[PDB]
Each structure stands twice: as C-alpha cells, then as structure tokens.
Amino acid sequence: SGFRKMAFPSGKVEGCMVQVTCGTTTLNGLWLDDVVYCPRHVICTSEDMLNPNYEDLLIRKSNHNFLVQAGNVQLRVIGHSMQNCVLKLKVDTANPKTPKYKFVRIQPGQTFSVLACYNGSPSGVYQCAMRPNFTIKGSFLNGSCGSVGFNIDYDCVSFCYMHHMELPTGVHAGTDLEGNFYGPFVDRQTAQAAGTDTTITVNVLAWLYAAVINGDRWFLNRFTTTLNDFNLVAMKYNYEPLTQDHVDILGPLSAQTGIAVLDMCASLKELLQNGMNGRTILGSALLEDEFTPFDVVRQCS
Amino acid sequence: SGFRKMAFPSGKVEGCMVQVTCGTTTLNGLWLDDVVYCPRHVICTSEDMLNPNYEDLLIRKSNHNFLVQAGNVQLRVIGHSMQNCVLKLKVDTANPKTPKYKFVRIQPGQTFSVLACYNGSPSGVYQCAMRPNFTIKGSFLNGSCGSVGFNIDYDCVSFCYMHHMELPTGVHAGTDLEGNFYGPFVDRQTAQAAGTDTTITVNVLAWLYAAVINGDRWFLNRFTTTLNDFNLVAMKYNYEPLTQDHVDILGPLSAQTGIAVLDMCASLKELLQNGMNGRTILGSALLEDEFTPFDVVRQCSGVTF
Numbered sequence: 188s189g190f191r192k193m194a195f196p197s198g199k200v201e202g203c204m205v206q207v208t209c210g211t212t213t214l215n216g217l218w219l220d221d222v223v224y225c226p227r228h229v230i231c232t233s234e235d236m237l238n239p240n241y242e243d244l245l246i247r248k249s250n251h252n253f254l255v256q257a258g259n260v261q262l263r264v265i266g267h268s269m270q271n272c273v274l275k276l277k278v279d280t281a282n283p284k285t286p287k288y289k290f291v292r293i294q295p296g297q298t299f300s301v302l303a304c305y306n307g308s309p310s311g312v313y314q315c316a317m318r319p320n321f322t323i324k325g326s327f328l329n330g331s332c333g334s335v336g337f338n339i340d341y342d343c344v345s346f347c348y349m350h351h352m353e354l355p356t357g358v359h360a361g362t363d364l365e366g367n368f369y370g371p372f373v374d375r376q377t378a379q380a381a382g383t384d385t386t387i388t389v390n391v392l393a394w395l396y397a398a399v400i401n402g403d404r405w406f407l408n409r410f411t412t413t414l415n416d417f418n419l420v421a422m423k424y425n426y427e428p429l430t431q432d433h434v435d436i437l438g439p440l441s442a443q444t445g446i447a448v449l450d451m452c453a454s455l456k457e458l459l460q461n462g463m464n465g466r467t468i469l470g471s472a473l474l475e476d477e478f479t480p481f482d483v484v485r486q487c488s
Numbered sequence: 489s490g491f492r493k494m495a496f497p498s499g500k501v502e503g504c505m506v507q508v509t510c511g512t513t514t515l516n517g518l519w520l521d522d523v524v525y526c527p528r529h530v531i532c533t534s535e536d537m538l539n540p541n542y543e544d545l546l547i548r549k550s551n552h553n554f555l556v557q558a559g560n561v562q563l564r565v566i567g568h569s570m571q572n573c574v575l576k577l578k579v580d581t582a583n584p585k586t587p588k589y590k591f592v593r594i595q596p597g598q599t600f601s602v603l604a605c606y607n608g609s610p611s612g613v614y615q616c617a618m619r620p621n622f623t624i625k626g627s628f629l630n631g632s633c634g635s636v637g638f639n640i641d642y643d644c645v646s647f648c649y650m651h652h653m654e655l656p657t658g659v660h661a662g663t664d665l666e667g668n669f670y671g672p673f674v675d676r677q678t679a680q681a682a683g684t685d686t687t688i689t690v691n692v693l694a695w696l697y698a699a700v701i702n703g704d705r706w707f708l709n710r711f712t713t714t715l716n717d718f719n720l721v722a723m724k725y726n727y728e729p730l731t732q733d734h735v736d737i738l739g740p741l742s743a744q745t746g747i748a749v750l751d752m753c754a755s756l757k758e759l760l761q762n763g764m765n766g767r768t769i770l771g772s773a774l775l776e777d778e779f780t781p782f783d784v785v786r787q788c789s790g791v792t793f
C-alpha cells in the first residue's frame with residue numbers, strides 16, 4: 188500500500204535528450220530516429236520576441252546555423268522544417284536509443300511525467316496534470332525549454348508535451364509534439380494570461396477512491412446526490428463540471444470499493460462544506476486533483 | 489519557477505534491475521558488475537518466514553535454485569552468499585550497463601529516489617525521506633521487494649535503500665545495500681510496529697525557503713528567535729531538534745533570500761502555534777518535511793546529471 192505522486196521511469200526519454208543552439212540561444216531538443224524536435228522560438232533574437240515572423244527568420248538559416256550536441260558528439264544537421272510551433276532538424280544519424288514511441292495530444296485533467304532538462308542533460312522527473320485552463324504547474328528555470336512530458340503505458344513512450352514558456356502567474360505553457368499549443372497561447376512575448384483555473388473534479392473523486400482502497404473511510408456519509416445537484420454545488424467552489432463520461436470512467440473504482448459514484452459525490456460535497464477538521468487524506472490536508480482514475484488503478488493494483 | 493517533488497532521472501538504475509526467482513517467490517534484484525543483490529528472504533517459504541534460519545535455508549540451496557532474468561535473457565549464477573539481510577548472487581556476466589556507483593548508508597531526514605519495480609521491470613519513480621523513525625512512506629505492492637533507493641552526485645549513483653517489507657500501518661522498511669536494516673526491524677513474519685514519527689525541522693525550514701524563492705511570503709514576520717527557545721517549541725510539537733549544523737547547511741538559502749534561519753524559525757514557531765489561518769504554502773496545507781536544503785538549492789538552480 189501507500190500512495191505517492193509517481194512519475195514514469197525516465198530512462199527511455201533520457202536517451203533522446205540533446206542540446207540545440209542557434210545564435211546565442213541554447214535549449215533542449217528531442218532526438219527520435221533521424222529528427223531533433225525543439226521549440227521554434229530558439230531561432231528568435233532580442234527584437235524577434237514580440238512579433239516574430241518565423242517563416243522569415245527560418246528561410247534565413249542554413250543547416251550549419253543549428254549546433255546539435257548529443258552528450259559530447261556534435262550531430263550534423265542535414266535539413267530544417269517547421270511544423271506549427273515546433274522546429275524539426277533532420278540529422279545524418281538515427282538515435283540508437285530511440286524507444287518505441289508515439290505522439291498524443293492529451294485533454295485537460297490528463298497527467299504525465301516531465302523530464303526537466305538543462306543543456307540537453309536531465310535534472311529531475313516529476314508528475315503534472317494539464318489544468319482545465321491548458322497550463323501546467325511545473326518546475327522550470329531558464330534553459331528548460333524543449334523539456335518534454337510523457338506517459339509510458341506498456342513499453343511504448345507517448346510524448347504529449349514540449350515546454351515553450353512561463354506565463355506571468357508562474358505556470359507553464361507548451362505544445363504537443365506536432366507543435367500545436369495547449370490552450371489559446373502563442374510563442375510571442377506579447378502579454379498573455381491563463382484563464383481562471385478550476386479543480387479537476389473527476390480526479391478528486393478518483394483520489395477519494397484511492398483513500399478508501401488504502402483503508403480510510405472517515406469522510407464517507409449516508410447521503411447521495413443527483414449529478415445535477417452535485418454540479419450546482421461543486422461549481423460554487425470553482426470545481427469542473429462532472430459529466431456522465433466522468434461517472435462512467437469511475438465505474439471500475441466504484442465496483443472495487445462498492446461505493447456508487449454519486450455516493451462519493453455526496454462525500455466530496457460535504458468535504459467542500461466542512462474541510463478536513465485537522466485530518467489528512469493520503470498525507471494531504473487539501474483535496475488532490477493530479478491523479479486520474481487510470482493513475483489510481485495503475486498504482487493501487 | 490515552480491517547485492515540485494522531483495526524483496532523480498532513473499535511467500542509470502533502470503539498466504540494473506533484474507528478476508530473481510527462488511522456488512515460488514519472484515522479486516527484484518540489482519545487477520552491478522558480476523553480482524545480483526536481492527533480499528535474503530527470497531529463499532523463504534510462508535512456513536520458513538515465521539522463524540527463519542537463513543544460514544540453514546541457504547546452504548540447502550544451490551546456484552541453479554536461483555532463476556535470474558535480465559529482460560528475456562537468463563543470467564548464469566556461479567556463486568551465492570549472504571551479507572546481513574542481502575543475498576549476493578555472483579553471475580557469469582558483468583552488467584555492461586553498470587554505472588559509476590557507490591553503496592551509501594543515509595541518515596534520517598535525508599531524501600532519495602525509489603524506482604518501484606515488479607518482475608524486474610521498472611514501474612515508477614518517486615522521492616522519499618528516511619523518516620526519523622527509520623520507515624519510508626512508500627507506494628509498494630506485492631512483488632516490489634528488491635526495488636532500490638538512490639541519489640546521484642554528478643555521474644555517480646549512490647544506492648542507499650533496498651525494499652524488504654510493509655509494516656501494519658502501511659509504511660515501509662528495508663536495508664542499505666550491505667543488508668543492514670534502517671530502524672529496529674527484522675526480516676521475519678513477526679509483530680513489528682513503526683515508532684511514533686517526528687517532523688524533520690531542517691527540511692520544513694528548507695521548504696519555507698523554497699516558498700519564499702517562489703514568491704509565497706505571507707508567513708514571513710519581523711521576529712527572530714534562538715535555538716534554545718525554538719527547540720523548546722520544536723520538542724512540544726514532535727519536531728526534531730534544530731542543531732547549529734542545520735543552520736550552517738541552510739546558510740546558502742538564508743543568504744539568497746535575506747531571511748536568517750532564526751528569522752525563518754520565528755516564522756515556523758508561529759505556524760506551529762497558529763496554523764496557516766486558511767492559507768497554503770506552495771499548494772500544501774501541511775508543513776512539508778521531505779525536501780532537504782540540498783534538494784531546494786539543486787531544484788532552484790537547475791543542477792543536471
């Protein structure tokens with residue numbers, strides 16, 4: 188037993204991380220088969236930060252303006268193309284460490300591991316969720332751009348996030364590995380701010396099911412609720428609406444614990460009303476929302 | 489910016505994990521050079537585990553009684569011996585993935601990364617502290633035994649923990665890699681409990697420094713204090729005593745924020761007495777004690793391996 192913020196083993200991603208330099212700018216790239224992926228803003232200079240014309244700045248570059256370093260080795264860039272906000276540098280060596288991989292665009296509430304990297308070297312691994320406002324609450328210093336987020340269900344590495352920038356509230360914005368931003372963000376230093384964030388209701392419920400699996404029952408009650416009455420209460424605490432999809436997804440955790448999804452919804456309503464009364468659930472005095480139903484089943488069974 | 493519970497990258501350690509089977513028991517082994525390390529309790533049956541004679545059980549075994557699998561490849565065991573509570577299975581082949589490594593024994597309050605594994609397959613990685621009561625608050629299911637805990641210092645992996653057992657309260661006990669238990673525990677099915685735990689004072693103060701560095705500053709105040717006065721408050725709240733050595737180790741963070749440790753201790757004195765008055769610090773309602781000063785300095789300065 189026990190319950191922890193648990194990241195995927197980072198080794199398969201570690202073997203893909205390289206340093207990309209262009210002009211005076213250095214960040215991380217992701218080396219898969221014969222392609223290095225990195226944020227396109229690497230090609231930006233000081234004045235190219237507000238209104239960069241990426242197609243104009245790129246056509247001015249030769250392959251040899253791009254310095255790609257895998258550990259001590261320099262890779263030879265033989266080709267450059269842009270897809271959305273991601274630069275793809277073709278190189279003359281396929282990465283011998285390339286794992287089984289795919290690119291997946293995730294939805295708000297999904298979790299993933301982040302391999303924070305500086306100068307193409309890994310610093311740490313941790314868990315994040317895509318917030319409802321399409322940001323992530325990461326840990327990222329200058330030079331971390333090109334760090335990626337991933338899942339590793341069943342030997343295949345699913346790349347779902349590449350880090351581009353920090354917003355003024357200290358949260359992080361980035362793209363899928365096809366270069367499309369999560370949320371309404373753009374790779375320009377024009378004033379941008381995340382929408383008001385909300386709590387990922389379905390994840391909070393999954394975590395209370397985790398608490399019950401680990402032998403805690405103090406917060407349960409003899410009440411139930413309609414889905415509609417639950418949503419009318421929850422949204423007064425800035426909780427995401429719970430959908431019939433969210434109810435379906437919790438069916439397996441409902442079956443394992445024998446507590447109906449809407450019974451657990453009643454427990455959450457009361458928790459929101461009462462707080463914890465000096466108690467903790469799985470070592471938190473707050474309601475945790477960065478574990479999905481899938482995460483709880485992976486870790487508890 | 490941002491501040492997260494952050495494990496070391498686990499790649500160097502993933503390439504060392506194998507499956508070890510003896511009779512009906514499978515668990516994990518650590519393959520370094522030409523030796524596989526695992527818990528000695530792999531040699532026991534249910535019946536053995538109530539009062540095991542490890543000497544006696546071990547001599548009865550032979551090399552071919554130990555099935556060691558690295559991926560889809562059997563390793564040949566050419567020797568077996570025991571060091572304290574760890575079994576050492578000498579194999580015919582050195583791990584070509586062996587990293588630069590030491591075996592290190594850590595102090596309570598020190599943190600490390602756990603690579604939870606099942607059937608020799610790495611499953612997840614998380615940060616832990618060795619609690620003052622010598623337990624770790626892990627996340628382990630059946631077949632997790634032989635999972636290991638480590639730090640990285642430059643390119644050298646320091647292995648500090650091997651998983652042996654779960655105590656009745658859901659917390660975890662194991663050994664260093666020389667097979668010495670952390671805490672007053674033994675590898676037998678008998679009655680064992682975690683001592684009452686205490687809070688790691690120097691780590692809480694490190695995490696307050698991380699909060700200030702990330703612009704969470706509400707708990708700061710005009711007051712200062714002394715070790716003696718603070719330590720009477722600490723003792724009252726089941727907090728480890730703060731030594732002069734801890735103040736020196738916080739020196740860097742105290743500098744970089746212009747809060748002196750006894751200035752911060754005055755902040756912490758007030759939180760224990762008053763609570764958080766409905767607030768959070770770095771998205772926690774609790775006083776987090778599983779980040780060391782080194783953890784905070786490294787994460788906030790982007791140190792790389």
Ligand SMILES: COC(=O)[C@H](N)Cc1ccc(F)cc1
Pocket residue numbers: 212228229230231232233235236351352373374375376
């Ligand atoms: C060329 O180096 C850079 O990355 C720029 N100096 C900074 C930068 C530009 C755009 C953006 F969306 C994020 C960051």
Ligand SMILES: [Cl-]
Pocket residue numbers: 292293294297
């Ligand atoms: Cl998704």
Ligand SMILES: [Cl-]
Pocket residue numbers: 315316317318322323324325
């Ligand atoms: Cl997040």
